[PDB]
Design a protein around this ligand. Structure first.
Ligand SMILES: [Mg+2]
Length: 533
């Protein structure tokens, strides 16, 4: 703490300094150590009792901070911390904005990490507690939320690092490297390419349209062929199809007979009020005052959350994913995962994050080591070590999104921003999924230069490349964009000006299949400049 900033910091309520410490409080006990590491400090240890909302760190808030939403779809972006006014939270989607919405509606909240020019504060895990930062009355305060759970014996704290260097991107990358080691992150050596139905057909996908695309896909460089939301009769009833679809097993065997890795979408922690599964098993869901607690509203229905502390539920999940694996599915887009982590009443007195982790661990076991798991709508930190790929932005769209605010509604411009601002997770936490390329020439408002901007940025960043189009509408230009994109993969990217507030970014990537590359993108002008070799 030779630094004046550092002498002014507090750790578990005491003046910051190196050492080993014990805080014995009325309702809890924490034993911690503050240790020097490369680039900064690590705070680790263990806690027992009822820590509640546990204060770990306090320092004066910086004027400008990079803040991160806990899940795939929420923003990672630079915000002015003094002029901040809280958002109104949509009561149908409360918990996507925050697992602690009493914070979000009052104070600036950042989940897992927060950054300023030259300094990263970041928790290395979220296995038990939800780690977050709030700006309370001009102070940056780091908390570990234990959701009123009580611990008879010590459990480990989520470690906190405080890193300092003028190269902020390097700091973020080092932070993410430490996260990956703390959580035995899965970084596959091979990244799948593929097709996804969603961004052309949406809920109106038919099997007949699917079959046309399946035939056409033989002319495109796609390993995986993934059916999205559309095939299922209700949310929760994943093995009952509707409309013109065959059985879930039959789809897999057609897809495999055409030579693709079959993939499929589920929302596995979600059951609708109308679903067979909820109607058969009403005590399978998280509760509020003893009754089903609405987790979110979507598909014009109340959607409940499976209670992943229940063995009956985890057995059902195991059987479901085991069946899909038996059928031939080897790629799983597992969506709306925030549902499994909603606060409320569960059968076991465990945190929502502990519950969440037992559900995704079950799914991993059931599908096996040779299946690819793509997370979506998901808490980020709790999933490291389990998923192979992760959606890290809000949904893209077949339009740029000129009148779409940065509020989570679909838009190419906001999906692409998050692929930039979360670049440092890629090849550290998992493979980043920037959401699908949309390269068709009809049934879209995107220009050729917008499609290029999106696609080439994704390539430079080495992110997963999945296309979502009616392939009969993809012509020479789309095929050219896809081919050139795939040539930009394979490098080690860096967003050199991660703290930019004007949506212009300079991005380098060393050692791509096209050598050292650089792309300057402007999300406001919708322009890029790319240099190769
Ligand atoms: Mg890579």
């Amino acid at each position: 703490p030779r630094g004046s900033h550092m002498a002014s910091m507090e750790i578990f309520g005491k003046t910051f300094r190196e050492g080993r410490f014990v805080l014995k409080e009325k309702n809890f006990t924490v034993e911690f150590a503050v240790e020097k590491i490369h680039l900064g400090w690590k705070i680790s240890g263990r806690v027992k009792g009822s820590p509640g909302r546990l204060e770990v760190l306090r320092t004066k808030a910086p004027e400008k901070v990079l803040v991160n939403n806990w899940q795939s779809w929420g923003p990672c972006r630079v915000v002015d911390a003094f002029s901040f006014k809280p958002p109104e939270i949509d009561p149908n989607w409360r918990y996507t904005a925050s697992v602690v919405p009493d914070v979000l509606e009052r104070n600036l909240q950042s989940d897992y990490f927060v950054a300023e020019e030259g300094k990263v504060y970041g928790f290395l895990s979220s296995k038990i507690a939800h780690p977050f930062f709030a700006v309370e009355d001009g102070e940056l305060v780091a908390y570990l939320e234990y959701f009123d759970v009580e611990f008879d014996d010590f459990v480990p704290l989520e470690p906190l690092v405080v890193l300092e260097d003028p190269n902020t991107p390097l700091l973020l990358e080092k932070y993410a490297e430490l996260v990956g080691m703390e959580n035995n992150a899965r970084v596959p050596k091979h990244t799948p390419t593929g097709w996804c139905s969603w961004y052309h057909y949406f809920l109106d996908l038919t099997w007949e349209e699917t079959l046309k695309n399946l035939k056409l896909a033989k002319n495109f460089p796609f390993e995986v062929f993934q059916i999205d939301d559309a095939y299922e009769k209700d949310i929760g009833d994943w093995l009952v199809t509707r409309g013109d679809f065959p059985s879930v097993e039959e789809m897999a065997k057609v897809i495999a007979e055409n030579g693709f890795i079959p993939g499929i979408w589920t929302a596995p922690f979600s059951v609708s009020e109308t679903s067979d599964v909820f109607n058969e098993h009403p005590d399978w869901v998280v509760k509020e005052n003893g009754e089903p607690k609405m987790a979110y509203r979507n598909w014009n229905k109340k959607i409940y959350a499976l209670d992943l502390s229940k063995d009956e539920v985890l057995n059902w999940l195991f059987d479901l994913f085991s069946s899909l694996r038996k059928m031939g599915y080897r790629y799983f887009k597992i969506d709306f995962l925030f549902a499994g982590a909603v606060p409320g009443e569960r059968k076991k007195n465990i945190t929502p994050i502990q519950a969440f982790r037992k559900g995704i661990e079950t799914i991993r076991k059931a599908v096996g080591e040779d299946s690819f798991i793509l997370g979506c709508g998901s808490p980020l930190l709790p999933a490291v070590g389990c998923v192979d790929g992760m959606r890290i932005g809000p949904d893209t769209a077949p339009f740029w999104g000129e009148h779409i605010e940065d509020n989570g509604a679909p838009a190419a411009r906001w999906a692409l921003r998050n692929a930039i601002t979360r670049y440092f997770m890629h090849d550290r936490f998992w493979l980043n999924d920037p959401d699908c390329l949309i390269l068709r020439e009809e049934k879209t408002d995107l220009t050729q230069k917008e499609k290029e901007l999106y696609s080439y940025t994704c390539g430079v960043l080495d992110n997963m490349i999945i296309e979502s189009d009616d392939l009969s509408l993809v012509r020479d230009h789309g095929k050219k964009v896809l081919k050139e994109t795939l040539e930009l993969l394979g490098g080690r990217p860096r967003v050199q000006n991660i703290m930019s507030e004007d949506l212009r970014y300079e991005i380098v990537s060393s050692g791509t299949l096209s050598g050292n590359v650089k792309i300057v993108v402007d999300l406001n002008s919708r322009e890029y400049h790319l240099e190769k070799e």
